[PDB]
Write a structure and sequence with these properties.
2 copies of one chain form a homodimer.
Chain A (H helix, E strand, L loop, with lengths): L3 H18 L1 H5 L7 H11 L5 H7 L22 E2 L2 H17 L7 E3 L13 E6 L4 E6 L10 E6 L4 E6 L2 H13 L3 E3 L4 E4 L7 E2 L1 H13 L2
Parallel strand pairs in A: 2-6
Antiparallel strand pairs in A: 1-3, 3-4, 4-5, 5-6, 7-8, 8-9
Helix pairs in contact in A: 1-4, 1-6, 3-5
Function (chain A): Protein involved in the regulation of cell wall assembly and 1,3-beta-glucan synthesis, possibly through the transcriptional regulation of cell wall glucan and chitin synthesis.
Subunit structure (chain A): Interacts with TYS1.
Protein name (chain A): Cell wall assembly regulator SMI1
């Protein structure tokens, strides 16, 4: 099925975990989008959000925290869950880039042929941001060996794109499983990843996702 | 809008024309698909057919063999069953290509530069490995549900229409423009106004696409 279950389940675990270990991060999780907000977005972008993505939006419209000054603390080990407004704005942003480009080194994909080998595509809908040009999001125009609505890395520093999940649900869930596995350090602090079981160092979450993907591919 | 109007309009023109100038070809046009046939197909392939494509199917489920000689100047309009069979056929090819002649697009980056894609749904066949059909996974400068050539001899893919409706309509306009010869007989294309020779319809579509691309390139 679509990964709606996983979405719903993940948000339970994430909502619970944040409330327990990091209230301040909890506060930042926004109220649900209404159905009209999302229909308006879908009309604006002329796309159908996959079911799981619509489910996540109907739980949290990204993160906010206006009274903070140092910037928002990204839920995903520093990366910020985007609001529907930001999703629309950035999607149109990247759509302009694709236009300007119609006339960047070599683009590749892991797995091979899973993601279109391009810098920007109109159908790559960003959902998470580093506020530094890079995104996780959902791919609505997969390559030949890709899957519709797979979750991918793309952006400024992602000449190679990685498929990091089959759907948004699986992604949210693996994030939830990291939290529960104790794979975290608080810097009541900034959230960053470490492999608890291996007494591993602090690592950028993107490098973790890329590594995992690579490993999974070779198997 | 979607190109549903154009679909519906085109089939009126095509149904009319065929009945007048080539009854035998008319006979080959099938009864409509039912909505369940389509839902069953959509489940089988796990895709949503574009609206215009669903409209065409609700007029004719392709052509039905007398042996069927192809409506589109020899190319056969596929039945839903053939669409499903061929889509799975092409889907297996992609799978086997994953375990490893330059593929290009006109316009550049409009169509994925690959031999086979799961989301290229064939609608017309060459009975020789080549297709016109609808692209549900466009390139960066493509458009969802644009109509493309693809297949065995299509190392370069061409976007020949913005939607299925526009395609059916341009076919209809060829017929009404007198751009045909009967070999009643077998239907083949000629440019009436240029007193032109007979031409393969794929070459016509390729030239047309190529010209259109080139006339638009000054604009930005």
């Amino acid at each position: 099925n679509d990964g709606v279950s996983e979405t719903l389940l993940a948000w339970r675990h994430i909502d619970f975990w944040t409330s327990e270990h990091n209230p301040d991060l909890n506060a930042t999780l926004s109220d649900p989008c209404t159905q009209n907000d999302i229909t308006h977005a879908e009309e604006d972008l002329e796309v159908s959000f996959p079911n799981p993505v619509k489910a996540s939006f109907k739980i949290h419209d990204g993160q906010e925290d206006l009274e903070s000054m140092t910037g928002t603390s990204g839920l995903f080990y520093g990366f910020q869950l985007m609001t529907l407004d930001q999703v629309v704005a950035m999607t149109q942003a990247w759509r302009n880039v694709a236009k300007n480009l119609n006339k960047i080194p070599d683009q590749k994909s892991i797995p091979p042929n899973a993601v279109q080998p391009v810098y920007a595509h109109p159908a790559w809908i960003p959902l998470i941001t580093d506020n530094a040009g890079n995104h996780i999001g959902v791919d609505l125009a997969p390559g030949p060996n890709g899957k519709y609505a797979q979750i991918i890395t793309f952006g400024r520093d992602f000449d190679t794109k990685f498929v990091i999940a089959e759907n948004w649900g699986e992604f949210l869930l693996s994030f939830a499983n990291d939290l529960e596995a104790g794979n975290w350090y608080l810097v009541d602090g900034e959230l960053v990843f470490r492999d608890k079981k291996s007494n591993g160092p602090i690592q950028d979450y993107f490098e973790v996702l890329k590594r995992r993907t690579w490993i999974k591919y070779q198997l």
